[PDB]
Amino acid sequence: TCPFYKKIPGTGFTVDAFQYGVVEGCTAYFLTHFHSDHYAGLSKHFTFPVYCSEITGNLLKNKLHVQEQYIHPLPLDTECIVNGVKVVLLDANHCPGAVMILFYLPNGTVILHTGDFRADPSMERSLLADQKVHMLYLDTTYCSPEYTFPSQQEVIRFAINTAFEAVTLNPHALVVCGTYSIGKEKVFLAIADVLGSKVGMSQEKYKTLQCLNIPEINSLITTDMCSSLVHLLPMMQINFKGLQSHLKKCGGKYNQILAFRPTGWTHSNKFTRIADVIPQTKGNISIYGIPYSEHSSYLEMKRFVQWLKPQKIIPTVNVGTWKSRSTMEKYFREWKLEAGY
Ligand code: NI
Numbered sequence: 530t531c532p533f534y535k536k537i538p539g540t541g542f543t544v545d546a547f548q549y550g551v552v553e554g555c556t557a558y559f560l561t562h563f564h565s566d567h568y569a570g571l572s573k574h575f576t577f578p579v580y581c582s583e584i585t586g587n588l589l590k591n592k593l594h595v596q597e598q599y600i601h602p603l604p605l606d607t608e609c610i611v612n613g614v615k616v617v618l619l620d621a622n623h624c625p626g627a628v629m630i631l632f633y634l635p636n637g638t639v640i641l642h643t644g645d646f647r648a649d650p651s652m653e654r655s656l657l658a659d660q661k662v663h664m665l666y667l668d669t670t671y672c673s674p675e676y677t678f679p680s681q682q683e684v685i686r687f688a689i690n691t692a693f694e695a696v697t698l699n700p701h702a703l704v705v706c707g708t709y710s711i712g713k714e715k716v717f718l719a720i721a722d723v724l725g726s727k728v729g730m731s732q733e734k735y736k737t738l739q740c741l742n743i744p745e746i747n748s749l750i751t752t753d754m755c756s757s758l759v760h761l762l763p764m765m766q767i768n769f770k771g772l773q774s775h776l777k778k779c780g781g782k783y784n785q786i787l788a789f790r791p792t793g794w795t796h797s798n799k800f801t802r803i804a805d806v807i808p809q810t811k812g813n814i815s816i817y818g819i820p821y822s823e824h825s826s827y828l829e830m831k832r833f834v835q836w837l838k839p840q841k842i843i844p845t846v847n848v849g850t851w852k853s854r855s856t857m858e859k860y861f862r863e864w865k866l867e868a869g870y
Contacts, residue, residue: 530549531543531546531549531552534666534843534844534845534848537632537640537642538634539634539635539636539638540612540614540632540634541554541555541556541557541612542555542556542557542558542559542611542612542614542632543555543558543559544559544561544630544642544644544666545559545560545561545567545568545644546558547560547567547568547569547570547571547575548569548570549570551577555577556578556612557577557578557579557580557601557611557612558577558578558579558580559579559580559581559630559642560579560580560581560585560589561581561621561627561628561629561630561642561644561645562585562621562623562624562626562627562628562644562645563584563585563588563589563592563624563626563711564624564645564710564711564712565710567644567645568589568593571589571593571595572593572594572595573593573594573595573596575595575599576599577599578599578601579595579599579600579601580601580603580611580616581600581601581602581603581626581628582602582603582605582618582626582627582628583602583603583604583626583742584625584626584740584741584742585602585626585627585628586600586601586602587626587740587741587742588626588711588737588740591736591739591740592736592737592740603616603618604618605618605619605620605628606618606619606655606656613635614632614633614634614635615632615633616630616631616632616633617630617631617656618630618631619631619652619655619656619657620655621643621644621645621646621647622646622647622648622649622651622652622823623644623645623646623647623712623823623824624645624710624711624712624713624823625711625712625714625741625742625743626711626741627644627645627646628644629641629642629643629644629646630642630644631656631657638663638664639660639661639662639663639664640662640663640664640665640666641657641662641664641665641666641837641839642666642845643665643666643667643668643845644668645668645670645823645824646668646824646825647822647823647824647825647829648825648829648830648832648833649829650832652833653836657837662837662838662839662840663839663840663841664839664840664841664842664843665834665837665839665841665842665843666843666845667830667834667842667843667844667845668824668825668845668846669830669844669845669846669847669857670793670824670825670846670847671794671822671824671825671826671827671830672827672830672844672846672847672856672857672860673827673856673860674827675799675827676794676798676826676827677794677798677799677826677827677828678794678798678820678822678826679803679820681715681821681822683803684803684819684820684821685715685716685719685821687803687804687806687819688716688719688720688789688817688819689719689720689723691787691817692704692720692723692724692787693723693724695785695787696724696758696787699784699785701782701783701784701785702783702784702785702786702787703758703760703776703779703782703783703785703786703787704720704724704758704759704760704786704787704788704789705759705760705761705762705767705772705775705786705787705788705789706720706759706760706761706762706788706789706791707761707762707763707764707766707767707788707789707790707791708734708761708762708763708764709763709764709765711737711741712823713791713821713823714738714741714743715821716789716791716819716821717759717761717789718749720759720789721749721757721759722749724758724759726757726758726759727748727749727750727751727756727757727759728749728750728751728757728759728760728761729750729751729752729753729754729756729757729759729760729761730750730751730752730754730760730761731752731761732752734761735750735751735752738750754779755779755780755782760775762775764790767788767790767816768816769811769814769816772786772788772814772816773814776813776814784813785813785814786813786814786815787808787815787817788814788815788816788817789816789817789819790816790817790818790819791819791821792818792819792820792821793820793822793824794820794822795818795820797818798820803819803820806818806819831860831864834861834864835864835867835868838868838870842861844857
C-alpha cells in the first residue's frame, strides 16, 4: 500500500510508486530518476503510462526492458499537458536524467516534488522564479546541521591532483574507481581526462553509460580493459582483497593501485578538510574515500527552502522514525521564523 507522500492530491498521479502493484485511481506514474529505491517494481511486464526524462526513458527501455509503448519522455523546462494537467520537469542536479516535477493543479494549487536533488542557487532562475508554490515534497536526506561536505568542484580538484601526482611518480600505477548505480560519473571521467586515458569497464556498465546522452562518450569509455589505465569496478570490490585480486588479472602490467570510493557524507567530514584527506594503505594498494554528494547539504537545503517560501513541506526521506520526523519539523519552523514567511 502506497504512502501518502507519493500521491499528488487532485490528480490521477503518483511519484516513484512502482512497488505497490496497481495503485487505485492512478492514471500516470511519474519516475523522477533511475535509482533502484525509486524504480523498485518496474520490469518488461509493466503496462501503465510512465512519465520521465529522455535519459530515464533510455534506461527503462534498455536496462529494465519496459516496452516502448508505455514510456513517455518529456523535455525539460517546457510546459506539457498530461491527462489534462499542466506539468514541467526541471533538472534536479542529482544523477543523469534526474528531474523535479512542477504540477499546476486544476484548483489553482502549485506543487513542487524535488525527487532526489542537490539544491543550487541556479535553481532560483529556472521557471521556479515566476510563481508561488503551495506544497513542497522535499528530499530531506541531509536535513541536520552536522551534514557538511565540500562543493563537487573542490572534490574533483582533489581527485584529479591526487591521481595525476601518483601516476606521474609511477607510470606503472593503475587507478580504480568504485560504482554501484548511475551518478558521480564526473569522478572517473575527470581522472581519465587528466591521465590521457579512456575509462575501462564491464559490458554491463558500458551499456548503462551509453544511455546517458553524455557528449562525445565514444571518445571517453571502452570495454577493452588492457588499453585503459582507469578501471571501473563494483563498489563492493573496493577493498584490499578485491583490489589484490583485480591486480593479478592485469598480467603484470601494473605494480600499484590507487582507488577511489565516492561515498556520501561520512563522520570523518565532522573533523577533516578535503585538503587533509588521507588514504587507507596496505602494501602497494591505497584507497581514498571522497565525499562527492549528489544530495543537498543542510545549508544548501535551507537556502533553497527559505528562497521558495512554501506554505507546506512534506519530507520524502527519513520519514520512518518519530525522532527523525520531529527533528525535521523543528528545522522547518526555525527556517520559516528566521525568514518571515
Ligand atoms: Ni537518488
